[PDB]
Amino acid sequence: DDMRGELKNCSFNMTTELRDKKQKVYSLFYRLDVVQINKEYR
Amino acid sequence: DDMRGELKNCSFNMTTELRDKKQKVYSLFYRLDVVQINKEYR
Amino acid sequence: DDMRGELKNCSFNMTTELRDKKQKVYSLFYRLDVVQINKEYR
Amino acid sequence: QLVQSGPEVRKPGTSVKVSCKAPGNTLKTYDLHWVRSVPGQGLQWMGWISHEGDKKVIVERFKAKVTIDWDRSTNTAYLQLSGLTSGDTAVYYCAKGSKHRLRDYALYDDDGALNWAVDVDYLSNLEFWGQGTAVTVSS
Amino acid sequence: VLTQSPHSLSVTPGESASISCKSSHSLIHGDRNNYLAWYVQKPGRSPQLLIYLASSRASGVPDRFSGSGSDKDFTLKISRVETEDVGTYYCMQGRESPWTFGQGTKVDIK
């Protein structure tokens, strides 16, 4: 119950070894560590 | 009459704090700092 | 006969003086300096 | 105006070819579209191949049997049909139009360059149309 | 997918007719551009354009043709019609690929 909203998946885009091609890289982050701007975060 | 054409109102594009977005930003530049390539200067 | 494929004529899209437009630019590279993925090399 | 190849009759099973020509080379910046007009059933969009040569979109419903080519040197649009069933017995029109290549999500770099951009393009209009070529398939 | 109403029309010459193309999606890219255009096909003739982006007519079409709308509701209000305006009408949406026609509205003089 204490982790309701305490972790975020926060998948986002990046550039691969080639600066032209794209790569959709997913990660993990803590709620205290991102800010809202589904719902986008930075 | 002295400062006719010695100040340029230039609007352009900039990378914002994030990167997936860009912003339209206007500024004032002295004529001695810009050169032609409204008109496109650099 | 000793340069069969040793030299590669590679062209890319390096940015021009101003960081907004791409320009097609060619160069020569040694085969030991490129890796395949005409074809695509990095 | 535009010119299209004359009316054609084909036995079902083989392929057919249609040529759309511009007068000289006055229409090169405009993009190319192909449309079909089954009588009493409205009009369908065959596809398009753009003008810079970076797009080749053909609707999946006709993807297997229809090919669209553009010869730059002669400035000629080529439409190839393979199945040539009873449903293809209709009038095919070559259209020249313009699009809007908007810039959607783009990944600028730290120094300010452009790593990549989807820059999906939107169809705007089809100003110029061919006279229409009738293709008749009979068994 | 796209539709429009009424399916068929019959208006006395000299009057004004209005046909509405109902879409199924936003049909707006940013806020103002409305990537929907009108195409008219005369009997036994290649279709002719009347108005692109649902806002502005092209060069070579008179003032009679006029289309306007937003979001998903777009109407063309053809005013002061004559015998040269009888034919079928279609609406192209370029907002989403693949781009499709309509089912056609056949206008007739009443």
Ligand SMILES: *[C@@H]1O[C@H](CO)[C@@H](O[C@@H]2O[C@H](CO)[C@@H](O[C@@H]3O[C@H](CO[C@H]4O[C@H](CO[C@H]5O[C@H](CO)[C@@H](O)[C@H](O)[C@@H]5O)[C@@H](O)[C@H](O[C@H]5O[C@H](CO)[C@@H](O)[C@H](O)[C@@H]5O)[C@@H]4O)[C@@H](O)[C@H](O[C@H]4O[C@H](CO)[C@@H](O)[C@H](O)[C@@H]4O)[C@@H]3O)[C@H](O)[C@H]2NC(C)=O)[C@H](O)[C@H]1NC(C)=O
């Ligand atoms: C990494 O980069 C990729 C780029 O490849 C990026 O992908 C985008 O992802 C978002 C979110 O998934 C997509 O946004 C969805 O768009 C749906 C419809 O998109 C149409 O319109 C797009 C342009 O409209 C956008 O921009 C305008 C102007 O700013 C704005 O008004 C709109 O609201 C919208 O934000 C257009 O680019 C897009 O084109 C795709 O399809 C065509 C046709 O196949 C193809 O040719 C293109 O190549 C492209 O694939 C399409 O035409 C929209 O329905 C959806 O709406 C959501 O919310 C509503 C309401 O809650 C829900 O009802 C709905 O179900 C959805 O959940 C949403 O807005 C965006 O379109 C993608 N971009 C592209 C180019 O595909 C990733 O997000 C990046 N990763 C990040 C940022 O982490």
Ligand SMILES: *[C@@H]1O[C@H](CO)[C@@H](O[C@@H]2O[C@H](CO)[C@@H](O[C@@H]3O[C@H](CO[C@H]4O[C@H](CO)[C@@H](O)[C@H](O)[C@@H]4O)[C@@H](O)[C@H](O[C@H]4O[C@H](CO)[C@@H](O)[C@H](O)[C@@H]4O[C@H]4O[C@H](CO)[C@@H](O)[C@H](O)[C@@H]4O)[C@@H]3O)[C@H](O)[C@H]2NC(C)=O)[C@H](O)[C@H]1NC(C)=O
């Ligand atoms: C900062 O970054 C923004 C990013 O958005 C950028 O704005 C955009 O710039 C691009 C680049 O020009 C614009 O793309 C053009 O858009 C026009 C339509 O513009 C009208 O409509 C929009 C709304 O949709 C209005 O906002 C705008 O004010 C105008 O009223 C298109 O018509 C253009 O298409 C032509 O070019 C394409 C390739 O780029 C071709 O594929 C296409 O066929 C068109 O061809 C044209 O040129 C041919 C010759 O090359 C000619 O023969 C044809 O007849 C035709 O004229 C083009 O896609 C885009 O609209 C801008 N706005 C947005 C929201 O994206 C800023 O410019 C930038 N600031 C800088 C760099 O200082």
Ligand SMILES: *[C@@H]1O[C@H](CO)[C@@H](O[C@@H]2O[C@H](CO)[C@@H](O[C@@H]3O[C@H](CO[C@H]4O[C@H](CO)[C@@H](O)[C@H](O)[C@@H]4O)[C@@H](O)[C@H](O[C@H]4O[C@H](CO)[C@@H](O)[C@H](O)[C@@H]4O)[C@@H]3O)[C@H](O)[C@H]2NC(C)=O)[C@H](O)[C@H]1NC(C)=O
């Ligand atoms: C630097 O930037 C320039 C432009 O800014 C790039 O030049 C264009 O690059 C694109 C690639 O993104 C090229 O597009 C591709 O062209 C291929 C050429 O194919 C020829 O042969 C086929 C038959 O096999 C013909 O049908 C075709 O008309 C051509 O005559 C196409 O085959 C490619 O099509 C594939 O992709 C499209 C979508 O992109 C699909 O719809 C297709 O089904 C198919 O899968 C593609 O269209 C384009 O031709 C280039 N133009 C020019 C003038 O160079 C440079 O590539 C870029 N360079 C670098 C290093 O970044």
